[PDB]
Design an enzyme around this catalytic site. Sequence first.
Site, PDB file in Angstrom:
ATOM      1  N   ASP A  96      16.562  16.584  92.443  1.00 31.47           N
ATOM      2  CA  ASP A  96      17.969  16.757  92.103  1.00 31.47           C
ATOM      3  C   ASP A  96      18.806  16.673  93.371  1.00 31.47           C
ATOM      4  O   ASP A  96      18.847  17.622  94.160  1.00 31.47           O
ATOM      5  CB  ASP A  96      18.172  18.089  91.390  1.00 31.47           C
ATOM      6  CG  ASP A  96      19.528  18.202  90.759  1.00 31.47           C
ATOM      7  OD1 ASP A  96      20.386  17.334  91.025  1.00 31.47           O
ATOM      8  OD2 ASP A  96      19.742  19.154  89.981  1.00 31.47           O
ATOM      9  N   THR A  97      19.479  15.537  93.561  1.00 31.11           N
ATOM     10  CA  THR A  97      20.376  15.387  94.697  1.00 31.11           C
ATOM     11  C   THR A  97      21.661  16.184  94.524  1.00 31.11           C
ATOM     12  O   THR A  97      22.368  16.419  95.510  1.00 31.11           O
ATOM     13  CB  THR A  97      20.709  13.910  94.911  1.00 31.11           C
ATOM     14  OG1 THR A  97      21.225  13.352  93.695  1.00 31.11           O
ATOM     15  CG2 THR A  97      19.466  13.148  95.332  1.00 31.11           C
ATOM     16  N   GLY A  98      21.981  16.595  93.301  1.00 32.48           N
ATOM     17  CA  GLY A  98      23.135  17.423  93.036  1.00 32.48           C
ATOM     18  C   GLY A  98      22.904  18.907  93.190  1.00 32.48           C
ATOM     19  O   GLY A  98      23.833  19.695  92.988  1.00 32.48           O
TER      20      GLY A  98
END
Lengths: 99, 99
Positions: free
Chosen positions: A25-27
């Site tokens: 998850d880059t967020g």
Amino acid sequence: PQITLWKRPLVTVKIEGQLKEALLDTGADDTIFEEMNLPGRWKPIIIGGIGGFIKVRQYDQILIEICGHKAIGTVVVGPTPFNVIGRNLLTQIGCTLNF
Amino acid sequence: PQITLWKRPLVTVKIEGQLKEALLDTGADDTIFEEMNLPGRWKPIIIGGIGGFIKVRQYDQILIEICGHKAIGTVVVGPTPFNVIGRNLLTQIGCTLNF
Ligand SMILES: CC(C)CN(C[C@@H](O)[C@H](Cc1ccccc1)NC(=O)O[C@H]1CO[C@H]2OCC[C@H]21)S(=O)(=O)c1ccc(N)cc1
């Protein structure tokens, strides 16, 4: 590996001898997992996402081996729908977005 | 471009003639922006996150130009803390995770 985004970027993870599937998850600033026991002292904290906040237990210097790459960092335990590998550990394995 | 994950993967996006910064989120299936007006008919839907759910207006076939790359797809409008580019649009610009 190169990972396309047509399917959820799930990877098999080993943490405290347990096998789990986690979302790259880059967020996510931090890493959060479903309920589980972990070594070391923990501090109760609160994280906020889309639609509210949740209380969680914060653990430091936790080893994770995600898809064969090792990383140590803060891991948070609480009622999350999915295990999420956040940027605090993604950086450790050299994860980048490319387009 | 290559994007490391030491800082939030924020990118400048143009949508409906408006300039906004959005989060390249591999953990988001769908794209959602803060309150704004958009063309076409919309359907009220509900999305779920880490700490709860929110009501949102769903728009289809919405054009976005993210970092100079164009994509058309579903865009959701509601009370999100950050604008999030989800996998439904990341795939169109050819976004991949690499490590
Ligand atoms: C609040 C946002 C910045 C989103 N975040 C990461 C994001 O990837 C989550 C990660 C995620 C994934 C599944 C379930 C909950 C959270 N996905 C998400 O909220 O996307 C939603 C919109 O599209 C839908 O797809 C499923 C979730 C919906 S977050 O979960 O809340 C978050 C915030 C802080 C930390 N330290 C870790 C994670």
